[PDB]
Amino acid sequence: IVVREADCGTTNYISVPLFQPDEVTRSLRLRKRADIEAGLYGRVLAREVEVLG
Amino acid sequence: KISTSDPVRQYL
C-alpha cells in the first residue's frame, strides 16, 4: 500500500460520528476531545458543509 | 511406509 495518485474519482465516503452512547446505558454524549481529533484531523471533506457560519 | 521392513518382507 503506497500513495501514488491523482484525486481518485470514486467519492464513496464515510461519516465520522460526533456523539457516543452506551456507558450510562443510553445518554447521548459528545465524544471526547482527542477521539474526534483522531477521526477528523487533516482529512478531506467528502461534501461541503455549512456550519456555525 | 518406513523402507527396511517392506524390502525385508519383500525378498523374505
Binding site: - | 518406513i2 523402507s3 517392506d6 524390502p7 519383500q10 525378498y11
Partner: protein
C-alpha cells in the same frame, strides 16, 4: 569444502546427501546391466527415491542422519530456504552493513537538534575511504596505500 584447524575439514551437510544420491544411482546402473532380479532393482529404486527426497526435503518421510555423533537432520534444500531452524528469523534478523558503527550514548546539552556528537575516532574508521582520498588531495599523503599505512597505527597519525 574448507580447511579449518590442522586436519579438520568442514562442509555443507548437502554434500553428504548428494553422495547418497550419486552412489545409489550409480549402483542402480551397474545393477541393471549386470543382470537384474526384480527384488533388488526395486529395493534400490526405493532407496534411490528416498535419497532424492533427502536433498530436496528431509523429514517429510523420515529423518536422514550423519553417521553416529549427531542425530542432526541434514539441512534439506528447503530447510535452507524457509529456515526450519530459525534461519528465516536470522535472515530477516538483518544483513550486515559495511559502513556502520556502535557505541554508548550520552546527553549533549549544548548540541543542536540539527546535529549530534560522534567520536572522531569512530569517524576515522567509518569515513576512512573518503578520508584517504582527501589525504592525497592535501600534502598529508602521496597516495592511497600511503594514507592507509599512515593510519594503520594509532600513534602514527599527524
Amino acid at each position: 569444502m574448507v580447511q579449518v584447524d590442522g586436519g579438520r575439514f568442514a562442509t555443507s551437510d548437502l554434500n553428504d546427501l548428494y553422495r547418497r544420491l550419486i552412489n545409489r544411482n550409480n549402483r542402480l546402473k551397474k545393477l541393471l546391466a549386470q543382470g537384474a532380479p526384480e527384488i533388488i532393482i526395486r529395493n534400490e529404486k526405493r532407496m534411490l527415491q528416498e535419497a532424492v527426497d533427502a536433498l530436496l526435503d528431509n523429514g517429510r518421510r523420515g529423518a536422514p542422519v550423519t553417521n553416529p555423533g549427531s542425530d542432526r537432520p541434514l539441512r534439506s534444500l528447503t530447510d535452507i530456504l524457509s529456515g526450519k531452524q530459525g534461519r528465516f528469523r536470522q535472515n530477516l534478523l538483518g544483513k550486515r552493513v559495511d559502513y556502520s558503527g556502535r557505541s554508548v550514548i550520552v546527553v549533549g546539552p549544548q548540541l543542536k537538534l540539527h546535529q549530534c556528537g560522534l567520536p572522531k575516532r569512530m569517524a576515522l574508521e567509518l569515513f576512512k575511504p573518503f578520508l584517504l582520498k582527501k589525504m592525497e588531495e592535501k600534502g598529508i599523503a602521496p597516495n592511497v596505500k600511503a594514507a592507509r599505512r599512515m593510519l594503520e597505527r594509532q600513534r602514527d597519525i599527524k
